[PDB]
Coordinates of C-alpha atoms and ligand atoms in Angstrom, one line a residue:
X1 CA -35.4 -58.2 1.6
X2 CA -37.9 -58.1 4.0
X3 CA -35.8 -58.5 6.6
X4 CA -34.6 -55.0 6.1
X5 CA -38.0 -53.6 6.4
X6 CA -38.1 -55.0 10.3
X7 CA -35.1 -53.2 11.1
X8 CA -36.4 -50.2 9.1
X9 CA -39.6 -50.6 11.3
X10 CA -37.2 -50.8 14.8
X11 CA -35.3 -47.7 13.7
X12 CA -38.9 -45.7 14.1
X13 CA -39.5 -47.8 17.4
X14 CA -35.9 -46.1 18.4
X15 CA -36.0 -42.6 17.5
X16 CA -39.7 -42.1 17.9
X17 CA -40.7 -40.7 13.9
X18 CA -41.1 -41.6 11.0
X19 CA -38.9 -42.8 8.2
X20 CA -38.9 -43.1 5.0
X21 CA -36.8 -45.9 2.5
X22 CA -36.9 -47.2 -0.6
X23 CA -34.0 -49.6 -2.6
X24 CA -34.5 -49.4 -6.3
X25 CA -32.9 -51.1 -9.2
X26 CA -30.4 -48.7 -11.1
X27 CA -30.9 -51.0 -14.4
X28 CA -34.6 -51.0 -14.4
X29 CA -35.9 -48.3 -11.9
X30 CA -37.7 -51.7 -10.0
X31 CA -38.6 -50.9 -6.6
X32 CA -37.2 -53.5 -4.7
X33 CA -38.4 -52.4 -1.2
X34 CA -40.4 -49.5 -0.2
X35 CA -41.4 -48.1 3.3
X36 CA -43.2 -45.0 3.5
X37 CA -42.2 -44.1 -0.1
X38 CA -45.0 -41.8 -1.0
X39 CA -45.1 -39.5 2.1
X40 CA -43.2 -36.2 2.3
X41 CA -40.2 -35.5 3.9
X42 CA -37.6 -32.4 3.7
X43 CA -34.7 -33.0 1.4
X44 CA -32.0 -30.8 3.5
X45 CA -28.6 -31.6 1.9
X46 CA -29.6 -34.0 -0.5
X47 CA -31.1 -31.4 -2.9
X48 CA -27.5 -30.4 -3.7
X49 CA -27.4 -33.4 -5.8
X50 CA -30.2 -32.4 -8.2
X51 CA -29.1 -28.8 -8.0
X52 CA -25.7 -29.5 -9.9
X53 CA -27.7 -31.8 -12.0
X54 CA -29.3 -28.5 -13.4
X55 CA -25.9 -27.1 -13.7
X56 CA -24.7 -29.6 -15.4
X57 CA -27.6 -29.3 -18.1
X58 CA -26.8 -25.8 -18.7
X59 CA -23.4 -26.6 -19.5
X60 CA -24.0 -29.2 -21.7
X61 CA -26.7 -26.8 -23.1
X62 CA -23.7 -24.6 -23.1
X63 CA -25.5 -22.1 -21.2
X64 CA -23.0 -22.2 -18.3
X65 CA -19.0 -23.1 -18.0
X66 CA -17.5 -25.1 -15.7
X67 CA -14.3 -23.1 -15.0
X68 CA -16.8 -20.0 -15.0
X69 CA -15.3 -17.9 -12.3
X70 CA -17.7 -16.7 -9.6
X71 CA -16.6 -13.3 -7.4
X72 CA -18.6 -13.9 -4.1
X73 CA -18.3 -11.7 -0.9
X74 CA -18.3 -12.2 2.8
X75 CA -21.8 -10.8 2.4
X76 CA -23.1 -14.0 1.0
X77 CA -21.4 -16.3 3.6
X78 CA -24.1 -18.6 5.2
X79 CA -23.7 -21.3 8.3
X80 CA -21.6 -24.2 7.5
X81 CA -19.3 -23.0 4.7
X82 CA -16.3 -25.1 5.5
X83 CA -14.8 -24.0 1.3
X84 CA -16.0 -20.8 0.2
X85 CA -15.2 -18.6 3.6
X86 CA -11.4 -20.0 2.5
X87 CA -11.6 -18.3 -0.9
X88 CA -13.4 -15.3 -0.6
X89 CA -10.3 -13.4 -2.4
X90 CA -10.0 -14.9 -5.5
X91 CA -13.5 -16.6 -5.7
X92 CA -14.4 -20.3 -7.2
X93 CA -15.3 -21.7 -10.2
X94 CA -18.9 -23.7 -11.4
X95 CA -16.6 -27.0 -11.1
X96 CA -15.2 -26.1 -8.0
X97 CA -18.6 -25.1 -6.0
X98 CA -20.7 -27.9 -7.2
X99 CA -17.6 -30.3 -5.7
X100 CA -17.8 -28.1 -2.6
X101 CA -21.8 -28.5 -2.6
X102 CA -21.8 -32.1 -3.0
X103 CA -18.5 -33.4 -1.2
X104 CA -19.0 -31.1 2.0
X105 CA -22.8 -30.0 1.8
X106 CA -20.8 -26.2 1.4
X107 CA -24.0 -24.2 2.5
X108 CA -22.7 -20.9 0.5
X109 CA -21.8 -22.8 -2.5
X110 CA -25.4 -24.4 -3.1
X111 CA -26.8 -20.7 -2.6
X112 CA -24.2 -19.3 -5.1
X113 CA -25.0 -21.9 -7.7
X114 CA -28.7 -21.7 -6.7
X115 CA -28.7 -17.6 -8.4
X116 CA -26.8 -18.8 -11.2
X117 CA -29.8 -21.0 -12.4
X118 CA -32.3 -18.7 -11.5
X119 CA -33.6 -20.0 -8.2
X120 CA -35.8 -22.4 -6.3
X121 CA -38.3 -22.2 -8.8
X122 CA -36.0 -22.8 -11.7
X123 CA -34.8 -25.9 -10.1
X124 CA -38.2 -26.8 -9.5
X125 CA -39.3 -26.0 -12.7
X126 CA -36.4 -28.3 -14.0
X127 CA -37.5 -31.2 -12.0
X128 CA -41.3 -31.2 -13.4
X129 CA -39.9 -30.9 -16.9
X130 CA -37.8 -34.1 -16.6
X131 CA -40.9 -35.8 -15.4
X132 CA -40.6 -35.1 -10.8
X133 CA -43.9 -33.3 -10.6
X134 CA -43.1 -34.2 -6.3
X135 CA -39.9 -32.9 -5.5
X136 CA -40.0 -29.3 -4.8
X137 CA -37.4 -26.5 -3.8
X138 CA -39.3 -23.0 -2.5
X139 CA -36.5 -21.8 -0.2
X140 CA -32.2 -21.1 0.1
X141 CA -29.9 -21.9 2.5
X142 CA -30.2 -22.1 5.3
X143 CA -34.7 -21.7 5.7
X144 CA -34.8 -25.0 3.8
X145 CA -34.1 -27.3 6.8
X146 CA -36.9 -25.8 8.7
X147 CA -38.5 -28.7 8.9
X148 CA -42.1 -27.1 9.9
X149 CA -44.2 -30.3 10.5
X150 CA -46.6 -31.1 7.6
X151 CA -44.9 -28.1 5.1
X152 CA -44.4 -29.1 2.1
X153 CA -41.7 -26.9 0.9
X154 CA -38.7 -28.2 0.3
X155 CA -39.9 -32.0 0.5
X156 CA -39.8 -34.6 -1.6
X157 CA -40.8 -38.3 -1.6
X158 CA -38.8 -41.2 -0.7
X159 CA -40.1 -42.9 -4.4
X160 CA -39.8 -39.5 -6.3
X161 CA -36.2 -39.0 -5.6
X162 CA -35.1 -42.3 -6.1
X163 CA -36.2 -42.6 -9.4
X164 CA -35.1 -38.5 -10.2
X165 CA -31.3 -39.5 -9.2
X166 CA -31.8 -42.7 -10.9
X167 CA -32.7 -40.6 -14.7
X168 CA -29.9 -38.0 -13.7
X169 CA -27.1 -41.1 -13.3
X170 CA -28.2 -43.2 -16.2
X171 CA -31.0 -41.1 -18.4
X172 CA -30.5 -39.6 -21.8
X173 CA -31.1 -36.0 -19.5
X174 CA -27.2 -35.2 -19.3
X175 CA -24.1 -35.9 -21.3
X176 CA -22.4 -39.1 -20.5
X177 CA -19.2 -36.6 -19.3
X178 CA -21.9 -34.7 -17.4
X179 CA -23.3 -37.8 -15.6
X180 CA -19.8 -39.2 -15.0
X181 CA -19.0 -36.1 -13.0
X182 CA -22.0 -36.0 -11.1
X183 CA -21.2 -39.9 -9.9
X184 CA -17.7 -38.3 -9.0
X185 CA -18.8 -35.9 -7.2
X186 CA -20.8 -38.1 -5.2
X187 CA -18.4 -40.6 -4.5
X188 CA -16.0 -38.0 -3.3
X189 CA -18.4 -37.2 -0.4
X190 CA -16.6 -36.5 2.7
X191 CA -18.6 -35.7 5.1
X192 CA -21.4 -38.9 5.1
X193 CA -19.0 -41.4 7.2
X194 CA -21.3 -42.5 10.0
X195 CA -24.1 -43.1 7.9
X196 CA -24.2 -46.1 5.0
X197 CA -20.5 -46.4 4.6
X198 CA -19.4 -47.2 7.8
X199 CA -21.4 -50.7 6.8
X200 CA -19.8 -51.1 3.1
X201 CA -18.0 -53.8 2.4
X202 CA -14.1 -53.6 0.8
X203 CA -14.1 -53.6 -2.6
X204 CA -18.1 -52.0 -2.5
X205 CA -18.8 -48.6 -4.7
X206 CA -20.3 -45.8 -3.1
X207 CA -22.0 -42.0 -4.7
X208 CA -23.9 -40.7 -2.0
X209 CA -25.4 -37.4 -0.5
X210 CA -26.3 -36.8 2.9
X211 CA -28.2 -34.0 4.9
X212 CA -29.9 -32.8 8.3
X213 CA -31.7 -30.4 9.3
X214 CA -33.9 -28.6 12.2
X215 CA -36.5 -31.2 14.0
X216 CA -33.8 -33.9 13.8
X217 CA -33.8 -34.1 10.3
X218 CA -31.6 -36.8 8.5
X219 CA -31.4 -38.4 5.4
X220 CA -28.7 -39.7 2.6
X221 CA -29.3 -40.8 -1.0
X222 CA -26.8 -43.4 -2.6
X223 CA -25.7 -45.4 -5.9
X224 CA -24.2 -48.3 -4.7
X225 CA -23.4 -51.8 -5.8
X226 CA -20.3 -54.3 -5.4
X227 CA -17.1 -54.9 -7.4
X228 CA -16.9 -51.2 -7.6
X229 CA -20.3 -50.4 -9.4
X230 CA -23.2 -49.2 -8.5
X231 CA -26.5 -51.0 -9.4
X232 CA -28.9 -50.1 -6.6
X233 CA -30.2 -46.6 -5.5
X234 CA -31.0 -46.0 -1.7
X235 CA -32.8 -43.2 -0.5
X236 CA -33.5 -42.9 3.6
X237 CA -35.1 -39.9 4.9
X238 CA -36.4 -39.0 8.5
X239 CA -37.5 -36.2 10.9
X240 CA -39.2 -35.2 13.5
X241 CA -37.3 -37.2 16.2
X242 CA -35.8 -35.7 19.4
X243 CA -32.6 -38.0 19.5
X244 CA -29.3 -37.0 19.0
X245 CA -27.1 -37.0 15.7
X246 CA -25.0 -39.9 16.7
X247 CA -28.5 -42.3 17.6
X248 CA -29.8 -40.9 13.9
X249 CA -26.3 -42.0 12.4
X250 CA -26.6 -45.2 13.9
X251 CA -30.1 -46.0 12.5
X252 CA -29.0 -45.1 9.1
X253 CA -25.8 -47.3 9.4
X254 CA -27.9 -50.3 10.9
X255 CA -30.1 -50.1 8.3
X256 CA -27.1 -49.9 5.6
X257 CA -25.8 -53.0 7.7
X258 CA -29.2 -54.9 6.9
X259 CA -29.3 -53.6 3.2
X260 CA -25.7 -55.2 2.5
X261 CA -26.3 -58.3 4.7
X262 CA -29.3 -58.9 2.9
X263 CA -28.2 -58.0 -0.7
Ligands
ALP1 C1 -27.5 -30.2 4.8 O1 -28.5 -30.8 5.2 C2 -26.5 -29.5 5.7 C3 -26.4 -28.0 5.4 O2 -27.7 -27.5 5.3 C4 -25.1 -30.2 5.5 N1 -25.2 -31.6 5.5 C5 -25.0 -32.2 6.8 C6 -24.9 -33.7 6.9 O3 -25.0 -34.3 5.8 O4 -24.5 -34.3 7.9 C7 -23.8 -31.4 7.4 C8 -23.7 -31.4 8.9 C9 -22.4 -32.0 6.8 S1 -24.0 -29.7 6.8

């Protein structure tokens, strides 16, 4: 509705940069409505998502396990590792650092996950394979969320990752097991309160991703619908404004109030 693009419009007026939105249709990859959908914009967090996608593959591929047991050290401990610094003795399985990845954006865990597949550029060169010849992943954690203004490493497009996440959740690209427990994963996000599901309604389902990063970098990528299914993909990116996390939360969550008001 166009009625979300005004307040999508306002939230630039109120932190002073750009931002970048799209709603698609889950069913039949429609773009509903589209504001700034083809310009770049770093990924932070959200690349987590299409990094366990890639796992996922190789396990169905049978390539990789899930209860695959991985013996990190505290050498590999990055900022923000909320799961992995508690089991540094015993280590973490496949399973258990792509639910760290995606539920609480575990910095560690991505990187750990991210050797495993054989890098930036294998996840890259996944992405172009399954037809995303945009999104692109050059660096690990934590470089990524530079942010550097006009660099395009570790950007993607507002339109481009939309309809990537869209072929991971409903595309012939993973197993039906493999793209149940990606959606899990998702919904089992713990640390994206503030942002679009501070405005969902009861009963309302909800898979979504969120990252910063930096330059006040923010964004979050969702699957969700009412009556408990999803049936619309949001994607809302943004950088390069000087305000606070809280103002950037409350952009996002106003223009989640707008999207649901308006569904
Ligand atoms: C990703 O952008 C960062 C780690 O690089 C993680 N995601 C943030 C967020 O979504 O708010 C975090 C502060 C939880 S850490």
């Amino acid at each position: 509705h166009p009625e979300t693009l005004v307040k999508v419009k306002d939230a630039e007026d109120q932190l002073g940069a750009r931002v970048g939105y799209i709603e698609l249709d889950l069913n039949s990859g429609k773009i509903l409505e589209s504001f700034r959908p083809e310009e770049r914009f770093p990924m932070m967090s959200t690349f987590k998502v299409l990094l366990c996608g890639a796992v996922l593959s190789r396990i169905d591929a049978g390539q990789e396990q899930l209860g695959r047991r991985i013996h990190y050290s505290q050498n590999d401990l990055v900022e923000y590792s909320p799961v992995t610094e508690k089991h540094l003795t015993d280590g973490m399985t496949v399973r258990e650092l792509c639910s760290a990845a995606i539920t609480m954006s575990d910095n560690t865990a991505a990187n750990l996950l991210l050797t495993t597949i054989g890098g930036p550029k294998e996840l890259t060169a996944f992405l172009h394979n399954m037809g995303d010849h945009v999104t692109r992943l050059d660096r690990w954690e934590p470089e990524l969320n530079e942010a550097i203004p006009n660099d395009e490493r570790d950007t993607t497009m507002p339109v481009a990752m939309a309809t990537t996440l869209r072929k991971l959740l409903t595309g012939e690209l993973l197993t039906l097991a493999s793209r149940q427990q990606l959606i899990d994963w998702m919904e089992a996000d713990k640390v994206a309160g503030p942002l679009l599901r501070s405005a969902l309604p009861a009963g309302w389902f909800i898979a979504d991703k969120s990252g910063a990063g930096e330059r006040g970098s923010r964004g979050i990528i969702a699957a969700l619908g009412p009556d408990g299914k999803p049936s619309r993909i949001v994607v809302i990116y943004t950088t390069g404004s000087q305000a606070t996390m809280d103002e950037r939360n409350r952009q996002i969550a106003e223009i989640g109030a707008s999207l649901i008001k308006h569904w």
